[PDB]
């Protein structure tokens, strides 16, 4: 129905003996692999819950936000998701306070758009040096605010691919009462994240897979086609910077 258990060929595994012990519910007793494997039925149940929540959120015609900050793969991933589905997203370092305070950044995004249109209408009226300086600042602003530019109010939903590495983002989201869903790997603290998704995020094959199911889940509510979700077999085969070698040092 929704990503049957056969397709999760590589969906469990994390560095040895670094797991937060309060997550004993999801992880079964430890085995030889020493990588805390997850129960796939509860994984599918969590995916169902996230799907049916984000679908209703999109039906409400609100604003949802995407977060990706790890080095290369997740950044390119969220860029692809953004260019495929009309979703707010963040690709660079979280700017420490985007949601908890918004008046001090709404002015910044408004300045970004105003200077973008200033460039669009300026027919080289000023000097070349003046033209070069403004475009450099445009590039600077797009480097940080290229994602969150088409929003007016506080994002009513945000995703995080690694709550531990994004403790700032999840903490800021939890200062308010807005919901947050995270790829809660075995080392995070589940008391903060609202909807827990005990999947693997360090490995490349699983993060792209689950991000794509979530992107199609929000896309189908917009009538758009689902590239990676609900679609059946001989598909969901993602190009792989190969997925092997779970242990880290």
């Amino acid at each position: 129905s929704l990503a049957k258990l056969g397709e999760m060929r590589t969906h469990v595994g994390m560095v040895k003996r670094y797991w937060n012990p309060k997550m004993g519910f999801f992880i079964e007793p430890e085995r030889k692999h020493n990588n805390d494997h997850f129960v796939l039925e509860l994984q599918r149940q969590s995916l169902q819950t996230a799907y049916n929540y984000v679908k209703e959120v999109a039906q409400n015609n609100g604003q949802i936000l995407f977060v990706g900050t790890k080095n290369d793969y997740v950044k390119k991933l969220v860029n692809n998701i953004a260019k495929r589905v009309d979703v707010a997203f963040i690709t660079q370092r979280w700017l420490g306070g985007t949601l908890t305070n918004f008046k001090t950044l709404s002015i910044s995004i408004n300045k970004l758009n105003k200077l973008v249109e200033k460039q669009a209408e300026n027919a080289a009226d000023l000097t070349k040096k003046e033209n070069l300086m403004l475009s450099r600042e445009i590039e600077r602003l797009e480097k940080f605010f290229g994602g969150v530019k088409s929003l007016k109010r506080l994002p009513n939903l945000l995703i995080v691919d690694d709550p531990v590495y994004e403790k700032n983002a999840v903490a800021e989201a939890n200062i308010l009462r807005i919901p947050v869903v995270a790829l809660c790997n075995t080392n995070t603290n589940p008391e903060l994240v609202d909807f827990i998704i005990p999947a693997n995020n360090h490995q490349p094959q699983s993060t792209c897979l689950l991000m794509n199911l979530l992107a199609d889940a929000v896309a189908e509510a917009k009538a758009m086609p689902t590239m990676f979700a609900y679609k059946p077999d001989e598909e969901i085969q993602i190009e792989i910077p190969q997925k092997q070698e779970a242990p880290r040092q």
Binding site: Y53, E56, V57, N60, G62, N156, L157, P179, D194
Partner: peptide, 5 residues
């Protein structure tokens, strides 16, 4: 929170 709205 069950459901948004």
């Amino acid at each position: 929170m069950g459901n948004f709205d």
